[PDB]
Design a binder for this molecule. Structure first.
Ligand SMILES: *[C@@H]1O[C@H](CO[C@@H]2O[C@@H](C)[C@@H](O)[C@@H](O)[C@@H]2O)[C@@H](O[C@@H]2O[C@H](CO)[C@@H](O[C@@H]3O[C@H](CO)[C@@H](O)[C@H](O)[C@@H]3O)[C@H](O)[C@H]2NC(C)=O)[C@H](O)[C@H]1NC(C)=O
Ligand SMILES: *[C@@H]1O[C@H](CO[C@@H]2O[C@@H](C)[C@@H](O)[C@@H](O)[C@@H]2O)[C@@H](O[C@@H]2O[C@H](CO)[C@@H](O)[C@H](O)[C@H]2NC(C)=O)[C@H](O)[C@H]1NC(C)=O
Ligand SMILES: *[C@@H]1O[C@H](CO)[C@@H](O[C@@H]2O[C@H](CO)[C@@H](O)[C@H](O)[C@H]2NC(C)=O)[C@H](O)[C@H]1NC(C)=O
Ligand code: NAG
Lengths: 237, 202
């Protein structure tokens, strides 16, 4: 086998909430660890275990509890979540030597849940100028107004997910104190853009509240959802 | 118990060599590693050292030399390539000591744009009147993308996109503003060749 899986991958919590991050490995490794990555600190060890049934504290164990129920499971329990705990958490399993990692869990612990807002995604069309001189067409997608920045932007052409030619921002930028933005380019050939049968779609999967979760406001619950903007190729002359 | 990476960022050109410095403070006979992180995934091990040969190799001629002598484990790559851009982390452990990581070093390798055509285009969002933004593209990897000044105006950081052709690498940055009438000519004032969306049928 080959796997270390974290869940949930994304999470929004309120100050004082209970959060449990899970990790399951199909490596039989005796060791498991929980780290948090933060700008200016790289990865810092929180807790770890040398074997099923036992827990050992890492360097910054305050605020977190760990629990290794069996060989392949290692959980981090933030009993009373605090804003300082919003971070990207990584789980790893290890056989005395090199560590095998998970994909990460994005966690936001808010003082006020009502700051959670989904994005508005806009699809800007290719410049005719660029098209004329370069025979290439850059479609740029722009998502804005989303508070948690737990999102993934994708491109779909004629129903199939596209990778060649795309370049989206590696990190969402904050455009206000509780609002983020993210962009992406999809450059195609003028020939391809000029075909009216070609259907372009910029998707942005937003991770927000769960159906369970209480929403303390008279507005739509900002639940997890996909939001898209699309366009079709245009003929020319 | 302690690892130190002095440089948080290293910008190198494709073709040029790369060295990442790592200093460690461990009582014991430390174990030493170098992990790399591609954008938004976990860390993948790059190379490791436990005992014997002080010079360890990894994938792609990535070398790391150990020295109790002066407590370092510097990473080196003879010639770097665009795909090498990532965050490189150094780590130290030991018998019954969990891995300790450095703060990381983001390596930004600039590709060679053979024939660059700096142009700033104004794009439009049809399903929204007034909605427009500026696309700065095809510039050379050495030029510095202008920074924002005002509120209500934003300029992203350069990104490099690749198409499926031998050339097809292009630099780009995006800008937009909620202002009444500011053009792409002034927000990207420190650059070359502004092609305006004057449009022509033939
Ligand atoms: C152009 O846009 C700016 C920025 O506003 C933001 O635009 C995007 C980037 C979005 O992602 C959002 O984050 C946001 O809409 C406008 O600046 C904003 O101006 C308003 C009006 O003055 C400010 O509201 C005030 O907020 C203070 C807070 O103490 C209250 O006391 C006031 O009662 C009032 O409501 C807002 O704070 C300010 N935003 C920032 C980040 O400074 C700008 O007005 C707009 N200009 C035009 C001409 O449209
Ligand atoms: C360990 O450091 C030595 C010395 O380098 C300098 O002196 C330090 C103590 C510090 O104050 C800095 O100014 C410098 O880092 C390195 O010396 C070189 O060693 C190589 C062989 O390893 C030799 O071929 C060079 O000629 C030496 N340099 C000089 C100026 O003579 C040494 O490389 C370091 N050890 C390792 C394993 O890298
Ligand atoms: C948002 O859109 C994505 C992409 O279409 C959906 O992804 C699918 O998710 C299910 C369950 O997670 C998988 O079995 C499929 O294989 C996924 N497809 C792809 C192409 O990734 C996702 O489910 C959608 N989410 C919401 C909340 O609507
Ligand atoms: C483009 O403008 C820059 C910035 O002023 C300048 O340094 C450069 O000389 C111009 N381009 C060329 C090819 O000279």
């Amino acid at each position: 086998e080959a796997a270390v899986t974290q869940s949930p991958r994304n999470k929004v919590a309120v100050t004082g909430g209970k959060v449990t991050l899970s990790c399951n490995q199909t490596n039989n490794h005796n060791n498991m660890y929980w780290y948090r990555q933060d700008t200016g600190h790289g990865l810092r060890l929180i807790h770890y275990s040398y074997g099923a049934g036992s827990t050992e504290k890492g360097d910054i164990p305050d605020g977190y509890k760990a629990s290794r129920p069996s060989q392949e499971n290692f959980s981090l329990i933030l009993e009373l979540a605090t804003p300082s705990q919003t971070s990207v958490y990584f789980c790893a399993s290890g056989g005395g030597g090199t560590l095998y990692f998970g994909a990460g869990t994005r966690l936001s612990v808010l003082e006020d849940l009502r700051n959670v807002t989904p994005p508005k995604v806009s699809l800007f069309e290719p410049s005719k100028a660029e098209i004329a001189n370069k025979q290439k067409a850059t479609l740029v997608c722009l998502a804005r107004g989303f508070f948690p920045d737990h999102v993934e932007l994708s491109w779909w052409v004629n129903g199939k997910e596209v990778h060649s030619g795309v370049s989206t921002d590696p990190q969402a930028y904050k455009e206000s104190n509780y609002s983020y933005c993210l962009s992406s380019r999809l450059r195609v050939s003028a020939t391809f853009w000029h075909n009216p049968r070609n259907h372009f779609r910029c998707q942005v999967q937003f991770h927000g509240l769960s159906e369970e979760d209480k929403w303390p406001e008279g507005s739509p619950k900002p639940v997890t959802q996909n939001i898209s903007a699309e366009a079709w190729g245009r003929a020319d002359c | 118990q302690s690892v130190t990476q002095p440089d948080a960022r290293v910008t190198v050109s494709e073709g040029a060599s790369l060295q990442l410095r790592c200093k460690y403070s461990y009582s014991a006979t430390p174990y030493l590693f170098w992990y790399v992180q591609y954008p938004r995934q976990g860390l993948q091990l790059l190379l490791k050292y436990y005992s014997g040969d002080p010079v360890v190799q990894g994938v792609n001629g990535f070398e790391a030399e150990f020295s109790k002598s002066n407590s370092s484990f510097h990473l080196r790559k003879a010639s770097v390539h665009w795909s090498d851009s990532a965050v490189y982390f150094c780590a130290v452990s030991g018998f019954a000591s969990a891995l300790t990581f450095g703060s990381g070093t983001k390596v930004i390798v600039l590709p060679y744009i053979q024939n660059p055509e700096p142009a700033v285009y104004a794009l439009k969002d049809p399903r929204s009147q007034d909605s427009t933004l500026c696309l700065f593209t095809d510039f050379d990897s050495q030029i510095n993308v202008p920074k924002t000044m005002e509120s209500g105006t934003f300029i992203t950081d350069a990104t490099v996109l690749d198409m499926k052709a031998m050339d097809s690498k292009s630099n780009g940055a995006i800008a937009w503003s909620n202002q009444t009438s500011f053009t792409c000519q002034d927000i990207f004032k420190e650059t070359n060749a502004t092609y305006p969306s004057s449009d022509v049928p033939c």
